Design a protein around this ligand. Structure first.
Ligand code: GDK
Length: 261
C-alpha cells in the first residue's frame, strides 16, 4: 500500500467516468515520479481491486504499469503516467501523423498483446480509447477492468455488464466466449480506428446491425491512406471462425516484418 503523504495530486481532472475521476499526480520514491490516479458501494471496490490484481501480475514495456494502491479520502489506483492520453483522441487532433508512425504504434500494441496472450490473460476491451501514448512513438495498453486471468486448464473465459459489441468477435456475441483470439478481432477494429485517425467503427449502426453485417461476410472498408498490407491484416483479424483466426504471435510477426521491410 502506498503512503498518502508521498502522493501529491493536481487540482483538475484529466478525465472522468462512472467510476469517478482520473487526476495527474506525483509520487515521491530522491526521484519523484509523475503518476495517473484513478480516484473513486462494494461494486466499484471489487472492480478497482480486480484491475489492480491483474496489473500487479503484468510486467511489460507496452502495458501501463501499476505503482500501487492508496487508501485515503478515497480509494486510489496509482499508475505510470501516459502523458499524451487516449490514442483515438490524439489522432482526432493530429492528422500529420504518418502511416509509418501509426504502424509503429499498432505493432507496439501487438507486442503488448503477444505478452498478454503468453501470460494467459484476456483483455476484453481492446480499443483505441484504451491505448494510451507515452510519446508519439510509444504506446501502452490500459484499462484492465474487464480483464481475466485464464485458468490453467482452459483457453477461454465464459462470461455471464458493459457490452461494446462493435469490438466483439462473433463467438463473444453468440456464445459469450472470450479468448486471446477474441482480443485479436478487437485488435483488428483497433487498427481500423488508428488508420482512420480516431473515427468510430461502424458509424450510425446499432449492435444488432453490426452483427448482421458481419454474418453476411461484410467488413469495414480500407481507411484513406491505409497501406494494403495493413488492411489485409485487419481482415485476417476479422476471420469469423475462431479456429482459423491468427493469434497475437502471428499478428505481431506480420506487423514486425512489414514495418522493417
Ligand atoms: C479514463 C481516462 C483515461 C485517460 C485520460 C487522460 N486524458 C488525457 C491525458 C492523460 C490521460 O490519462 C493518462 C493515463 C491514465 C491512466 C493510466 C495512465 N495514463 C483521462 C481519462
Amino acid at each position: 500500500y502506498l503512503d498518502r503523504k508521498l502522493l501529491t495530486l493536481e487540482d483538475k481532472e484529466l478525465g472522468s467516468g462512472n467510476f469517478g475521476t482520473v487526476k495527474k499526480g506525483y509520487y515521491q520514491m530522491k526521484v519523484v515520479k509523475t503518476v495517473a490516479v484513478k480516484i473513486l458501494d462494494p461494486a466499484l471496490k471489487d472492480e478497482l481491486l480486480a484491475e489492480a490484481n491483474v496489473m500487479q501480475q503484468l510486467d511489460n514495456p507496452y502495458i501501463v504499469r501499476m505503482i500501487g494502491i492508496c487508501e485515503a479520502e478515497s480509494w486510489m489506483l496509482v499508475m505510470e503516467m501516459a502523458e499524451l492520453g487516449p490514442l483515438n483522441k490524439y489522432l482526432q487532433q493530429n492528422r500529420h501523423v504518418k502511416d509509418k508512425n501509426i504502424i509503429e504504434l499498432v505493432h507496439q500494441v501487438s507486442m503488448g498483446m503477444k505478452y498478454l496472450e503468453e501470460s494467459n490473460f484476456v483483455h476484453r476491451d481492446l480499443a483505441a480509447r484504451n491505448v494510451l501514448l507515452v510519446t508519439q512513438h510509444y504506446a501502452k495498453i490500459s484499462d484492465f477492468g474487464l480483464s481475466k486471468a485464464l485458468r490453467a486448464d482452459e483457453n477461454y473465459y465464459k462470461a455471464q455488464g458493459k457490452w461494446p459489441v462493435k469490438w466483439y468477435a462473433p463467438e463473444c456475441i453468440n456464445y459469450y466466449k472470450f479468448s486471446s483470439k477474441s482480443d485479436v478481432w478487437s485488435f483488428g477494429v483497433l487498427m481500423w480506428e488508428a488508420f482512420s485517425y480516431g473515427q468510430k467503427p461502424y458509424r450510425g449502426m446499432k449492435g444488432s446491425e453490426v452483427t448482421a453485417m458481419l454474418e453476411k461476410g461484410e467488413r469495414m472498408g480500407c481507411p484513406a491512406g491505409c497501406p494494403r498490407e495493413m488492411y489485409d491484416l485487419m481482415n485476417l483479424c476479422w476471420t469469423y471462425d475462431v479456429e482459423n483466426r491468427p493469434g497475437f504471435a502471428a499478428v505481431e510477426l506480420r506487423l514486425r516484418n512489414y514495418y522493417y521491410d
